[PDB]
Amino acid sequence: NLEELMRSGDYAQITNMLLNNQPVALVGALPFITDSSVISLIAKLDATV
Amino acid sequence: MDVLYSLSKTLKDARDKIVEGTLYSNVSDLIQQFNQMIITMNGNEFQTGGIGNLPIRNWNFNFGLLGTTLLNLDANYVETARNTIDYFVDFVDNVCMDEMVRESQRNGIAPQSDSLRKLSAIKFKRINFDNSSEYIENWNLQNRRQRTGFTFHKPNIFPYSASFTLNRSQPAHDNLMGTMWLNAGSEIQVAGFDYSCAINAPANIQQFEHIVPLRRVLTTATITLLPDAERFSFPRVINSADGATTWFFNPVILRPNNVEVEFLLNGQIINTYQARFGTIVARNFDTIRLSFQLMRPPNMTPAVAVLFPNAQPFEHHATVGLTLRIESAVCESVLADASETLLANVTSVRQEYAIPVGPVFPPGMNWTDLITNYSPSREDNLQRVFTVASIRSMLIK
Amino acid sequence: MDVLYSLSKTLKDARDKIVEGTLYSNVSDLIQQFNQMIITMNGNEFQTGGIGNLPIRNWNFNFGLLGTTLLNLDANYVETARNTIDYFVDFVDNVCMDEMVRESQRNGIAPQSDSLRKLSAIKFKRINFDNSSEYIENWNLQNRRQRTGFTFHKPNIFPYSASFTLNRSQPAHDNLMGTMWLNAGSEIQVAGFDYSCAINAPANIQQFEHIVPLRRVLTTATITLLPDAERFSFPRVINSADGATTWFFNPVILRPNNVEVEFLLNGQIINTYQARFGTIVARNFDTIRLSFQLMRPPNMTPAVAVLFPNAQPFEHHATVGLTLRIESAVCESVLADASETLLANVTSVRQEYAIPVGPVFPPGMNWTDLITNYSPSREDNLQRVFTVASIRSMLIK
Amino acid sequence: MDVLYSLSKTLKDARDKIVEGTLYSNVSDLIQQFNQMIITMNGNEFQTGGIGNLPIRNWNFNFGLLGTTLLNLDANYVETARNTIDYFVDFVDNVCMDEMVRESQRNGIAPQSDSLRKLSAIKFKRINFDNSSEYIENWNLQNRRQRTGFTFHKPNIFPYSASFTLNRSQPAHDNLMGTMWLNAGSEIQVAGFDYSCAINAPANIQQFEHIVPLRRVLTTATITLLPDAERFSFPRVINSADGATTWFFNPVILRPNNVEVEFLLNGQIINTYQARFGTIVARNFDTIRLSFQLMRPPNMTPAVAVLFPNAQPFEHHATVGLTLRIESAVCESVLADASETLLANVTSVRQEYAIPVGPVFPPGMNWTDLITNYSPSREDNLQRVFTVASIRSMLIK
Amino acid sequence: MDVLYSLSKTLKDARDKIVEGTLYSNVSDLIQQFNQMIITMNGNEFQTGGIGNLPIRNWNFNFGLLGTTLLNLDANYVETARNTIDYFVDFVDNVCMDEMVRESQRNGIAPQSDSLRKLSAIKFKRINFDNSSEYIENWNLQNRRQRTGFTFHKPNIFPYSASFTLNRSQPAHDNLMGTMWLNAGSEIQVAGFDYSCAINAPANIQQFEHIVPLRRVLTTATITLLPDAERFSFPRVINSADGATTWFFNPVILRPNNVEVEFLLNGQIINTYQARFGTIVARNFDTIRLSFQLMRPPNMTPAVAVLFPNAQPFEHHATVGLTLRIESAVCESVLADASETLLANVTSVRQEYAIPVGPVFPPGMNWTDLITNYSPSREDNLQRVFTVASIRSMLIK
Ligand SMILES: [Zn+2]
Known part of the structure; x- marks a missing residue:
């Protein structure tokens, strides 16, 4: 839950699962970048956000 | 092994300390260790079982951390804690049953299951917690050779x-002389008998002796030493040495004259006790030497003088006994006793899942055959499996 | 019940941890729980006793909080702490003696005294602390049915x-056959005797059998199984079945041939042991079946052959015994044993204050009549009163 | 004494809690107490030993404090902690062996060694920590007379x-009457015998009685009371009262008619039990009175009627026994039992270093001579030395 | 289990409350629960069956929510509701038939089917609804040990x-004495007969006794107690004890003199009734003791005096009977009776799909063999399967 993550502020976990590359599903209500590019698909842009 | 005790100690404390309505300062140092445990155990997968009828279970850990923001713990926090604790308790139960069931002739002190070999990394070393139980203390002290x-x-x-x-014996078995004994558990009952009641022995005194070697060196043992061994004091018929014929034993009991109980360590007399009964102490020993003797009574009433003739037919046989019961003792190696249930847990796990007989332990976990030939590799395997049994006995009741 | 254990655990720790000269960081998490306890217990009044000679005492709590401003605890803080602790220890002593004395046929697991029914509210739920003792752990696990x-x-x-x-019997009582037993505590001593020594039995073998049903299912039991039951091995005169006449028993002891000890759970053979003595294990059982047999010795020396004629006068009677002693066992229900003193505390409280016999427990707290008919309502009452006895045994020595 | 337990409790916890890889919040309250201990103990010198073969050792404390800046304890911190802990453990081992070896007739509850007299100052009072073991709790409660x-x-x-x-006796020793007993450990085995089997007693009933005074008042004792004392049930020859002649004892066993077991405190009957065997309870007592009687059986089969003639030659002697075994009991004074090893540690230290016999304790630490004359000065010395033995048994395994 | 009852309660109410033309305020609180059920159950897949001939069915839930915008429910809403309800009713029917068919010796109170193990998560906990039926109330109360x-x-x-x-018997079988009984369902019919009609008994009175132990403790039982057991009052020929020969029984009926019906709980007399027939009450009991006696009539007319001679040939045999019929009773454990059909549903499901005999229940679901050995594991399995049978009997008629 991204809302409870925003509330607590201890992180502790998404820091861990982000540094050590562990699969995860962030439940929130984020806005997104729609992106129409195959070069941006090959360059692997989503791991950088 | 240290991290397995640490997992079980935190799960025991988190069943104990994390309750409904308790103050947060009572559990403020436990929730941080339990969160460190969750953070360490996430992303890892384990596989337990696979020998005998112990089923293969796959373990995957994906849990959220516990909240650190209450003043009094409400029932929401208790229910999510009980969920995470029940999953980890099932995991550590199956890891302990996977570790007690395995053994190795080569190096038994090493972990044998795949899950405990995976937990023996430094990635899992931050799980570690206090090591306060006796078996994990002796594990950590013998891991440094103290x-x-x-x-x-x-x-x-x-x-x-x-x-x-x-x-002294013959095929008639009517004039016999020698000792009988029962060594069982912590109790030695010995009885030397003479059928002639030392009527031709020099000075009417027959010397008996019974030497019990131990397998491990006991230290600071309180021992109840009583005379008059009760089991060898009633008439019985006994098979011979080759098992061919049987011979009759009709005892009358004299008191043990000149009892000398010696506690030998490497052949040296550490403690000795001369005609002292009741509770005795033996500070350091691995051999117990009982030296009692039968003396013919020089003055006998007419009710006694008809029992012991000078001739051959002895219908009443002189018998002299001792009883030696180790009440409590400190031993450097692992054993079994009347207080713990760890051997019972090991045998229950090995008999419940129909486990084949391996290279080290006796078939059916025969403790008599295990302490008869108590090799150091079997000692290492027994200590490892008893430590894991103590861990599971902390978690599983 | 949870808050009563919590009161006693904090009072035990505050007698232990709050001492003179100790550092404040050693007691910084205990003083907050003790202040939460004082804050919760103020303004409330209680009434303990009122049955038998247990006197009615009224309890009023008006205490100030303890200071949280020292670095090393000086003797002022220790003396005011000892005052508040002594008042709360007297309170919890009288609540525990008020709870162990009462019982109910309807729902025994519920609190019966007025004080513990008042403590079972959620106003007092913030008293709660860790539940680390074995009886309160099993209380909390059976409150969730685990x-x-x-x-x-x-x-x-x-x-x-x-x-x-x-x-086999007759009014002459000179040719008898059957078993004798002593079931006491954790020890079964059984002995089958034949006066003819199987001189007319088929293949000179007489089969004996002794089946002991248990009341509760024992689990992971270490059991010392020895041959040659010692109590039934000396001559005695015994009243008959109707108590009319007495008959004489002059035993000579053969060894038990073909011992089969079976541990039955719901009629299914869980563990079996064929001619194996020493320490055995029984993982799960509620019935113990001992099947030993007396075999006439086919080769006998002339000292033995005069004992067993083919004719009627048998002055020496063949007797074969076993001894089975449960050293330690894990049972799901509460019991009494040689280690704890909880039954002794319950009987001491019920006998000290001259308490009338109620609907559940036997008169005089007869443990033989309590384990003879061990009903589940009596089980619930016994577990509740043993838990309260464990709490009082923590506080009162 | 309080600071010695505190030193040992911190060293035990710092061997347990300070391990490699553990989180700092698990040990954050222990490192502050251990640093307070180092700060208090620096600059002080001690001298242990000097009696018997216990060697004189000089102790000087110059240590740096432990770091308070790690998140997970690495192996550097563990190794420097193990160095400081091993030096302090050797110090407290030699202080405990210096204190258990000494005694005083004047005031035994005071410290006798020079090191523990030096530790009894208020400079060392800030070492103090929780007092949670049973012996230090009873030490602190009896230091305030509770x-x-x-x-x-x-x-x-x-x-x-x-x-x-x-x-009833005569120099022929063919018609005797009276009791025999064995008082050993926690077990009383008593047996009253009559050779005539009450053939001339009024109403064919012979009353026996056996009164055992205790040395200290036991409280809440669970006691296994069985009939038919097993040791006095087989034939034996026994020396006379003056030791001149020997007399023969050929028992046949009747059951004990009209058993009355009374538990006397100051001559007042606290508990009484009339013909009830199995497990009994005795809440408060210092005298045990067993009153059993031998009744001649009025109906006897022809196998029994040949045993007991009306005339003089009795080849079979009527014998009636009881067995009383205190399984567990709460005593206000210190004792020895089958569970602890503290007496074994005290005797091991006094026998290892060849210690001369002092004014209080018996030669060789004879527990029979120590509980035979159990004076209050010997009680104070025994409690002090058992408390120090419990402290050393915490540190030294 | 709670969510399965909740699914069935909502489907029962939604067949009942959601009808054509009904007002929306009558169903405004049911449609919200049914929509919560649809929202919870979407996206989940289940698999039912797989044992015996019960076919494997896969369940996938993809449904739209029901409308919340009508004032009176029209037939469109009723038809789409009937579609969704029929699919969920088929699902819960197959889940209940998958759960009643399975059993476990280890922990029978836990769900055994895969579908009910999947429904026991907290994701499905928001399905939960009122628990108003008797079996789910007793399920929820015994899940908290009340x-x-x-x-x-x-x-x-x-x-x-x-x-x-x-x-009293002989191979001639012409002078017999003893009891006969029929224990069936809730009815005890007992009849003691004497062929001599107490012509040589003391005071012409023969005492009979019949003790029926129960398996579970009944509470607040209304019992019709009548004299003159009707089944054992006509002439019949009966095989012997070994089944070798047959013997004839020609009864004439006396009335039962001195009827004493006692209701024993743990050997203690709870209720007693002396010569009172009609409807009686027994508040708490697990043993029924009937003590009636046959008294020879001292005054007999010449039509009666020819029936009972003093000599041997008795062509008319005196017989005295009682009948005891438990009309209604409250029992803490589950049973079968003449009102419910739950045992019939369990046996119909186990016999319809040709199910192999498992470890717990008797072959063919023999209720006589199930209540003969009514173990607590079999009790837990029987209660679980009866609760699921009650759930399916709510949905499926
Ligand atoms: Zn013991």
Whole structure:
């Protein structure tokens, strides 16, 4: 839950699962970048956000 | 092994300390360790079982951390804690049953299951917590080669050995002389008998002797030493040495004259006790030497003088006994006793899942055959499996 | 019940941790729980006693909080702490003696005294602390219907039953056959006797059998199994079945041929042991079946052949015994044993204040009559009163 | 004494809690106490030993404080902690062996060694920590004169006294009457015998009685009371009262008619039990009175009627026994039992270093002679030395 | 289990409350629960069956929510509701038939089917609804270990036991004495007969006795107690005890003199009734003791005096009977009776799909063999399967 993550502020976990590359599903209500590019698909842009 | 005890200690404390309505400062140092445990155990997968009828279970850990923001713990926090604790308790139960069931002749002190070999990394080293139980303390002290001591109440140091010895015998079996004994659990009952009641012995005194070697060196043992061994004091018929014929034993009991109980360590007399009964102490020993003797009574009433003739037919046979019961003792190696249930847990796990007989332990976990030939590799395997049994006995009741 | 254990655990820790000169960081998490306890207990009044000679005492709590501003605890803080602790210890002592004395046939697991019914509210739920003792752990696990285990050293699972059985008998009582037994505490001593020594039995073998049903299912029991039951091995005169006449028993002891000890759970053979003595293990059982047999010795020396004629006058009677002693066992229900003193505390409180016999427990707290008919309502009452006895045994020595 | 327990409790916890890889919040309150200990103990010198073969060792403390800046404890911190802990453990080992070896007739509850007299200052009072073990709790409660209780499993309350009493006797020793007993450990085995089997007693009933005074008042004792004392049930020859001649004892066993077991405190009957066997309870007592009687059986089969003639030659002697075994009891004074090893540690230290016999304790630490004459000065010395033995048994395994 | 009852309660109410033309305020609180059910159950897949001939069915839930915008429910809403309800009713029917068919010796109170193990998560916990039926109320109360009671009309507490007992017998079988009984369902019919009609008994009175132990403790039982057992009052020929020969029984009926019906709980007399017939009450009992006696009539007309001679040929045999019928009783454990059909549903599901005999239940679901050995594991399995049978009996008629 991204809302409870925003509330607590201890992180502790998404820091861990982000540094050590562990699969995860962030439940929130984020806005997104729609992106129409195959070069941006090959360059692997989503791991950088 | 250290991290397995740490997992079980935190799960025990988190069943104990994390309750409904308790203050947060009572559990403020436990929730941080439990969160460190969750953070360490996430992303890892385990596989337990695969020997005998122990089923293969796959373990995957994906849990959220516990909240650190309450003042009094409400029932929401208790229910999510009970969920995470029940999953980890099932995991550590199956890891302990996977570790107690395996053994190795080569190096038994090493972890044998795949899950505990995976937990022995430094990635899992931050799980570690206090090591306060006796078995994990002696594990950590013997992992650095220091002196340890397990305190046992009535230790099963003696293998079951009920037998006898005929110092004087013949195929008629009407004039016999020698000792009989029962070594069982922590109790030695010995009785030397003479059928002639030393009527031709020099100075009417027959010397008996019974030497019990131990397998491990006991230390600071309180021992109840009584005379008049009760089991070898009633009439019985006994098979011979070759098992061919049987012979009759009709005892009358004299008191033991000149009892000398010696506690030998490497052949040196550490403690000695001359005609002192009741509770005695033996500070350091691995051999117990009982030296009692039968003296013919020089003054006898007419009710006694008809029992012991000078001629051959002895219908009443002189018998002199002792009883030696180790009440409590400190031993450096692991044993079984009347207080713990760890051997019972090991045998229950090995018998519940129909486990084949391996290279080290006796078939059916025979403790008599395990303490008869108590090799150091079997000692290492027994200590490892007893430590894991103590861990599971902390979690699983 | 949880808050009563919590009160006693904090009072025990505050007698232990709050001492003179100790550092404040050692007691910084205990003083907050003790202040939460004072804040919760103020303004409330209680009334303990009122049954038998237990006197009615009224309890009023008006205390100030303890200071949180020292670095090393000086003697002022220790003396005011000792005052507040002594008042709360007297309160919890009288609440525990008010709860162990009461019982109910309807729902015994519920609190019966007025003080513990008042403490079972959520106003008092913030008193709650860690639940680390074995009895409060099994209380909390059985309050959620999970598996529990009480570890007993020599459990009193057998009611006192010293009796016999004559498979072959007559009013002359000179040619008898059957078993005798002593079931006491954790020890079964059984002995089958034949006066003819199987001189007319088929293949000179007489089969004996002794089946002991248990009241509760024992789990992971270490059991010392020895041959040659010592109590039924000397001559005695015994009243008959109707108590009319007495008959004489002059035993000579053969060894038990073909011992089969079976541990039955719901009629299914869980563990079996064929001619194996020493320490055995029984993982899960509620019935113990001992099947030993008397075989006439085919080769006998002339000292033995005069004992067993083919004719009628048998002055020496063949007798074969076994001894089975449960050293330690894990039982899901509460029992009594040789290690704890909880039954002694319950009987001491019920006998000190001259308490009338209620609907559930036997008169005089007869443990033989309590384990003879061990109903589940009596089980619930016994577990509740043993838990309160464990709490008071923590506080009151 | 309080600071010695505090030193040992911190060293035990710092061997347990300070391990490699553990989180700092698990040990954040222990490192502050251990640093307070280092700060207090620096600059001080001690001298241990100097009696018997216990060597004189000089102790100087110059240590740096431990770091308070890690998140997970690495192996550097563990190794420097193990160095400081090993030096302090050797120090407290030699202080405990210097204190258990000394005694005083004047005031035994005071510290006798120079090191513990130096530790009894208020400079060392900030070492103090929690006092959670049973012996230091009872030490602190008896230092303020409150009620204490030591819980013993099979306490050694009875001195070894195997003897007899002839209520009816003659130099022929063919028609005797009286009691025999064995008081050993926690077990009383008593047996009253009559050779005539009450053939001339009024109403064919002979009354026996056996009164055992205790040395300290036991409280809440669970007691296994069985009939038919097993040791006095087989034939034996026994020396006379003056030791001149020997007399023969050929028992046949009747059951005990009209058993009355009374538990006397100051001559007042606290508990009484009339013909009830199995497990009994005795809430408060210091005298045990067994009153059993031998009744001649009025109906006897022809196998029994040949045993007991009306005339003089009795080849079969009527014998009636009881067995009383205190399984567990709470005693206010210190004792020895089958559970602890503290007496074994005290005797091991006094026998290892060849210590001369002092003014208080018996030569060789004879527990029979120590509980035979159990004076209050000997009680104070025994409690002090057992408390120090418990401290050393915490540190040294 | 709670969510399965909740699914069935909502489907029952939504077949009942959601009808054509009904007002929306009548169903405004049911449609929200049914929409919560649809929202919870979407996206989940289940698999039912797979044992015996029960076919494997896969369940996938993809449904739209029901409308919340009508004032009176029109037929469109009723038809789409009937579609969704019929799919969920078929699902819960197959889940209940998958759960009643399975059993476990280890922990029978846990769900055994895969679908109900999947429904036991907290994701499905928002399905939960009121628990108003008797079986789910007693399920929820025994899940917290409180007292329960099932009210039965004529409970099948007695196993079928039609047998007899000959207190006086011979191979001629012409002068017999003893009791006969029929224990069936809720009815005990007992009849003691004497062929001599107490012509040589002391005071012409023969005492009979019949003790029926129960398996579970009944509470607040209304019992019709009538004299003159009707089944044992006509002439019949009966096989012997070994089944070798047959003997004839020609009864004439006397009235039962001195009827004493006692209701024993743990050997204590709870209720007693002396010569009172009609409807009686027994508040708490698990043993029924009937003590009636046959008295020879001292005054007899010449039509009666020819029936009972003083000599041997008795062509008319005196017989005295009682009948005891438990009309209704409250039992804490589950049973079968003449009111419910739950045992019939369980046996119909187990016999329809040709299910192999498992480890717990008797072959063919023999209720006589199930109540003969009514173990607590079998009790837990029986309660679980009866609760699921009650759920399916709510949905499926
Ligand atoms: Zn013991």
